[PDB]
Write a protein that binds this ligand. Sequence first.
Ligand SMILES: Nc1ncnc2c1ncn2[C@@H]1O[C@H](COP(=O)(O)OP(=O)(O)OP(=O)(O)O)[C@@H](O)[C@H]1O
Ligand SMILES: Nc1ncnc2c1ncn2[C@@H]1O[C@H](COP(=O)(O)OP(=O)(O)OP(=O)(O)O)[C@@H](O)[C@H]1O
Ligand SMILES: Nc1ncnc2c1ncn2[C@@H]1O[C@H](COP(=O)(O)OP(=O)(O)O)[C@@H](O)[C@H]1O
Ligand SMILES: [Mg+2]
Ligand SMILES: [Mg+2]
Ligand SMILES: [Mg+2]
Lengths: 52, 52, 513, 173, 460, 458, 85, 85
Amino acid sequence: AQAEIEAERKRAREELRKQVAILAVAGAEKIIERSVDEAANSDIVDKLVAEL
Amino acid sequence: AQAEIEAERKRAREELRKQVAILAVAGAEKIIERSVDEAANSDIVDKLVAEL
Amino acid sequence: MQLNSTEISELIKQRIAQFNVVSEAHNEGTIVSVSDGVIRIHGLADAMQGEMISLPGNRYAIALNLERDSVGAVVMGPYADLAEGMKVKATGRILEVPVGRGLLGRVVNTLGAPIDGKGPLDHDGFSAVEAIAPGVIERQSVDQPVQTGYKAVDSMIPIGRGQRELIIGDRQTGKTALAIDAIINQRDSGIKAIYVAIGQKASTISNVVRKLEEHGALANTIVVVATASESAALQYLAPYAGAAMGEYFRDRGEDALIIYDDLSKQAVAYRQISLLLRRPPGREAFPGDVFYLHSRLLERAARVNAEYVEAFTKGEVKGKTGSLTALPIIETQAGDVSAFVPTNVISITDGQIFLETNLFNAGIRPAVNPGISVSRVGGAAQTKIMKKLSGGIRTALAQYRELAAFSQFASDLDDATRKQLDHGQKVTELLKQKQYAPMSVAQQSLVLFAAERGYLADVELSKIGSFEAALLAYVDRDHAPLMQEINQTGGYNDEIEGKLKGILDSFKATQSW
Amino acid sequence: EFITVARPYAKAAFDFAVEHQSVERWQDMLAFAAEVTKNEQMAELLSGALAPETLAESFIAVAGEQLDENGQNLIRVMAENGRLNALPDVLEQFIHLRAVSEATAEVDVISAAALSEQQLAKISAAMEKRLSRKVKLNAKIDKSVMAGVIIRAGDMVIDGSVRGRLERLADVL
Amino acid sequence: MATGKIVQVIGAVVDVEFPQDAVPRVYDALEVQNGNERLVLEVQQQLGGGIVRTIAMGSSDGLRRGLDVKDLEHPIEVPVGKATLGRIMNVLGEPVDMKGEIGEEERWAIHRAAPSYEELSNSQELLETGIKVIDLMAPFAKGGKVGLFGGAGVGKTVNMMELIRNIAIEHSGYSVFAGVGERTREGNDFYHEMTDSNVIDKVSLVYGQMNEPPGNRLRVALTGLTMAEKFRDEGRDVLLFVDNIYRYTLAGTEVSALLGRMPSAVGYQPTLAEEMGVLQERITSTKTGSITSVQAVYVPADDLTDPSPATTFAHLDATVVLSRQIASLGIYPAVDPLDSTSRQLDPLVVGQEHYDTARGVQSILQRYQELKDIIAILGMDELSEEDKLVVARARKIQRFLSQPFFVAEVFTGSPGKYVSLKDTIRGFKGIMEGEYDHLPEQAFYMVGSIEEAVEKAKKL
Amino acid sequence: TGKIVQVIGAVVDVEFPQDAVPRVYDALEVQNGNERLVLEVQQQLGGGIVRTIAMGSSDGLRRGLDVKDLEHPIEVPVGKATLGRIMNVLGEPVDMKGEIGEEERWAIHRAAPSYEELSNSQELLETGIKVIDLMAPFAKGGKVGLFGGAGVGKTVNMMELIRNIAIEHSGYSVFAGVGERTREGNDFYHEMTDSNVIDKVSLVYGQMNEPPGNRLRVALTGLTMAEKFRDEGRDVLLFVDNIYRYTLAGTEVSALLGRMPSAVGYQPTLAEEMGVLQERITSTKTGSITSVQAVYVPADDLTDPSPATTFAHLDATVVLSRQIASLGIYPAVDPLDSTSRQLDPLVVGQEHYDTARGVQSILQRYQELKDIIAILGMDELSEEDKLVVARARKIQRFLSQPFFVAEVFTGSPGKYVSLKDTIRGFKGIMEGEYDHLPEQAFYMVGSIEEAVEKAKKL
Amino acid sequence: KATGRILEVPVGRGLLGRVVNTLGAPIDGKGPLDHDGFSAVEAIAPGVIERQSVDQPVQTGYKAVDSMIPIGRGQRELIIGDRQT
Amino acid sequence: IIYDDLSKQAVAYRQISLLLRRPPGREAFPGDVFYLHSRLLERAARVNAEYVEAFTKGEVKGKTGSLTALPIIETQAGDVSAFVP
Ligand SMILES: Nc1ncnc2c1ncn2[C@@H]1O[C@H](COP(=O)(O)OP(=O)(O)OP(=O)(O)O)[C@@H](O)[C@H]1O
Ligand SMILES: Nc1ncnc2c1ncn2[C@@H]1O[C@H](COP(=O)(O)OP(=O)(O)OP(=O)(O)O)[C@@H](O)[C@H]1O
Ligand SMILES: Nc1ncnc2c1ncn2[C@@H]1O[C@H](COP(=O)(O)OP(=O)(O)O)[C@@H](O)[C@H]1O
Ligand SMILES: [Mg+2]
Ligand SMILES: [Mg+2]
Ligand SMILES: [Mg+2]
């Protein structure tokens, strides 16, 4: 079972790497109280690929 | 043995949540850094003073 | 295997939908000194005594000294990272712990954080750590048994559901073993168990948990841990968290057994806290209110009538009485019961079980001293048969010890005195029992019947143990229905005595030790 | 710290100044008395174990801007108990009691950038109703907060900074 | 209006600053809102300017510096009179039995002066208890004070319960029970016992349990004393039972250190003897009415040398000492005949017969205590035959002093026995003489009257 | 940046600008004459004042000296570079050889391993000492504590344990001398070098001559080296020459730190100070640490708070008695107070358990009879009591054993005794097979066959 | 007045045969001291590596001591007992 | 060197210590009492030739210095178990 979950974690990384994309909600939709234009349209994927 | 395996799986899932949260808020910080607006800041100020 | 890796993302993201933009307001203070886990705070005009104070990071402090122009607080964790001038926010919350049925089988620190590594806690909300005990009018008399599984304790010194029974003795005399065996025995009695570890080293707790897991007891038990390394605040608060966790069951009408291990270490931690706060030391350098600490801690263990349970549950549970049973442990240094903490704890509790080094070295294990040990609930806690058998037994053994003191050099013994001496020696031999081997009520009753009705007399002293083992095996194989009847009912009648007498005669005739 | 011992002297001095309607002069005298205490040679003199009266008469010598009938009495009273070092704290508590008596409160405002006059006006108006006292705002905008504003009055704090929101959000972890 | 403000909260001690012209008097009550719950404070000291140090009659948790404190210009006053009968009240005189309002007509301050020298009485009317050792060695007197000394677990509570069942039921008069520092379970059991036996209507109960803060335990006894004094001043004869006097001094010791007093002796407060005298001197029988009191006194580690048990010895009239050394043998009531004593035990009261019997028993037991030391090492054959006879008869008397109480059947499983004074005298006379030399030692153990020891000897 | 403002014995107060106050446990540096003195921060007082303990002689310090703030705690070399060398508390080399070829340095103040990481083990570790492995056997990776007064022989027993245990253990070892004799350290180092085993042992020495700060902090350095060896995944052996001195140094410095005295004048934080040190010496799933600690007992009072607190942290406790040592019986182990967690029928098996409990009961009965014997003499005893006394005396004699390290004292050659031989001999003695032999036959004999051989010549 | 010296005491072979106060002042009537400079009263003993093992004999006259309780050069040997023994 | 009545020294530290209000430990001696004797006695040692050469600056070679000490302690009623002994 440990050897199964060890590979499954390596499978899990891509879902974690994908879902870091959705950060515009966490900061933007809280701090401006309105929906916001995607000023970080390039910086979002920059953060995604650099952080994970 | 089966209970130990299930417990390790739950711990791994919580570990992944801990992993994602820190980098998510750290990326939201940069979203603020590169999407902030002086009109949005003034809106925040006027909103909080209107309900102090 | 872990397709949930997609869904944990949604769980994370919905937190943002849960978050709130409201700007709150709070009272603020600044740290002016940091030393040995105690911090002095300037400001905090609105701080309350016993309030949870929030520190940088996710750390908390407890306000204890509300002096003029300064607040003294103790840090509940590693204090070394704090620094002068840090900003401190006063919340409105008192200390609360997670509580609920889901705590069973989990190992949690005094704050309720799970340290077993079995993932996050399932719980039924939070309850205050500090709480008042039920008043006079809300309690009900203790008349129900909690079986220890030890012949000596269950016979001479009964413990009832709702009693406070002190286990007191010197180091390495088996105090922990007795309590964990009492926990083990509850695996099938329905009584929930709480084991609170104050100041013990973590490897001992690992061994205890492993022993509880080797049997079926762990799934019925909650373990609260405050290792020797943790700060004094956590150690001194540890018993109260366990008390609240047990009180969860007590108010819903369920029975809980809570073991406080080494309350002396809690008193030591509280003495450290008081001395660091520059409070005046009393006798033996202990603070004056140390009695109030243990007294208000132990008074929570009580049996409440059905009306209180109905009021607490708002009618969800009706007709059931809840009970919390506490077994504090105190270590004496050289048998000296005159020390401050032992005197206080002896004054508070409903009785004590004395374990002493001399009997343990003599081979009498458990080393229960029948003379100085006493239960203040007595026969009301026993089943009828056990009460009938042991009532004479305990004082007979005490007076036997006295007579053996008297007779030690007399060549001529009157036949009555010879009967008393032989009977006392055989009864003393009878009560010895191996660790991790609890005996059911029926077996204890059978052995005590064999002792009381004179059947043991002719058997030589050494064979008494083999006599007992052979009798237990023979009765278990040949006479199971009577054992089941005794275990279930616990009743005693003329036909019960007749069947027991017939069993004894048949065993003594047919069998061999 | 001399905070606890300074209180009775500050209270007495303030009540006396109120009964004689001379608060401002007293505040100036207290400031002057607090400055001479910080003198390097006077600090050594105060640290030494001189007799109270000789130390007092030596202290009065270095002050010619004191109202002798009342200021000398104050100094001699503090000297007789060795409290002369408490003067910088007596001054602060005197100022605090004066501000309480005049029903006036100082407020500090911290934000990522300078505020407009209208925002300042609304802040002052809200705070005056919150405290039921007159307010005097000061702006100490900060390099680290990137948005929002912090309002501190007394020790009560209202936080609307985005930094505070970021940390409060991570706490839900 | 409220005119004071809390300035310090340390433990159970709260300091309040008032205006300099309205400082509360000593022992005055104070009131403050601890959130939802109203809290009462008792002023102990006036210090500095306008500051008073107070003991909180409740939990200090939740108090803040700055809370407004109202000044109640009277000490703690409690309801008194017949309205109190059958009710359970706390230190403050508030009902805690859920039965509703007390409905009193008069209230009395708990702090009051002791009766003056001229008002005292010496009416030492003998009182029978039905216990062999108590009636023989330490006879009670009406209007006297009785103390039950002993360590933890020696039988003070069961002895007091037996005494209550004997006298207070037959007394035909009002009685007050002060549960100072008692266990809540035992107080509940006692209340239910009084209810089931249907005598609760004649008795009023005041309870301060262990879990309560030190102020409640410190002041709870004075409430019972005030109720008993109210009943006495009417001219009635009342019985006063105190659960444990020692816990009152323990509460005083707890509060003393924070009150700025320096320690003394074994860490007791310096005012130990003054407080003890102040409480004890109000429990007296004056010319208008009599108060008979039975007090249990905890002896720490059974050391009678300790100042708290040592001081109270002088205030009592009959002193019954329970010793764990006897209790270790299981022979209850475990009363020590060689330490117990009573003022009434002189020929002018008890008559020559009782005095002679008591002195004989004391001398025989004293001789046996010496002979046992020789026996322990050298063996019994080294004694003179007369010393052997003395050892035998003394060992018989020692067991004959035991008696089953029918308030302890739960423990023993045997029926209780009641004995008259005359039968006790005759039995001890018979054992002192040759009438019963032939009976075994076990023939007397927990028997009762001498008239049935022969029956157990036949049964043995 | 800092200025010294007070010097009280070993405690030095330093004032810093309020924006730069050093954290707790930060190391400071000050020039003291012609040498550099390190100070460790203990408490943060108000107004930028910080209270520190000097890691050296504090004499010659003036007020107003400039103090330099290092931004990190005391860090010591770790790893294989420390093998075979003697190191100071500060991690400096003390032998005359060159600098330590360190690759990594670790802070000495570290957190204990979490509850999850702990590992249980029951592998009995055999010793050559009859009484120790009979009455109080201990397992690999456990804690052993030697309790004794002054002069009863803690150090000799520890050296014999070192000699025996090192035979079957091929891993690294750490020896930490805390507040003991420098002469013993020099002798140990020289005898290690002569045997060419030095290259497997790291030695940290802060002896009694050192000021209190060195004795207080020295043990943590040894613990840090042992933890470095453990986390690498090895099996390490840790020996603490005297754990008592650590608490004694804490007591010495406690009063100057402004903390009210407790109990017998010990520091109030005694229990926490002992626990934080003891909790780090634990075997872990990544690696195991076997620990032997000598515990001084002040004035032979086993009820003193310092010995009393130590009892709970240990797995096996061996108590040495002065009264037995005065008989000339060595090792002077008290068998009625020595106890081990491992004395359990499941692990040791039934025969060992029964023999140990029989010996314990016989000796208890002898102790009970001795009070009568003192007054009336042995003649008054019953014939079974006399046999009990005769067997108990033989058992007491047989517990003695000649040590290889004690040859310089006794002259007679040392003995190594197997567990099988000791259990067989004690069972034979209790069964009465050897009741015809005199008491002296058993004195200082390795095995029972040697006992019968000595009997032939009496 | 603060002298610049840490506490020091006269030392040297010239002290031999003199009766001296703890400060170094002579109390006999035999005049001033000839000495080889001063030495610090408080000092740290030589470390581990500077010691050498004791193997030379200091012989006290008494047979019991030199036979049963040998004393070596560089050893520390406690003499302990009751009054007037 | 033969120190006489090292006990009479320990009584003297207690006086200088109790006069300085320092908290006493067991009996009435301060906890530093062990450090007092330990630092005095530990100076008695035998030093190898290399230390002598380093100290003498090469003037003396190949000779090992030594300092033997015989401290005297006085016990009440022959009680060897007292604190200071
Ligand atoms: N009934 C028994 N029969 C035999 N051995 C027993 C019995 N009870 C306990 N022991 C043994 O006694 C020893 C001490 O037991 P335990 O750890 O419970 O003691 P303790 O009083 O809690 O000790 P401590 O002071 O270390 O906490 C253990 O070796 C245990 O196995
Ligand atoms: N097996 C043995 N045979 C003979 N003598 C022994 C033996 N073991 C110990 N001793 C004696 O023990 C004495 C002191 O031993 P050791 O130096 O180990 O004591 P210690 O307990 O460490 O004392 P300290 O507290 O002074 O450090 C030695 O002088 C030696 O004679
Ligand atoms: N007269 C008696 N008969 C039988 N048992 C007694 C008697 N007196 C005391 N005991 C035993 O002593 C225990 C404690 O008695 P109690 O009076 O409650 O203690 P305390 O004196 O501390 O209040 C009881 O449980 C009971 O078993
Ligand atoms: Mg234990
Ligand atoms: Mg009682
Ligand atoms: Mg040693």
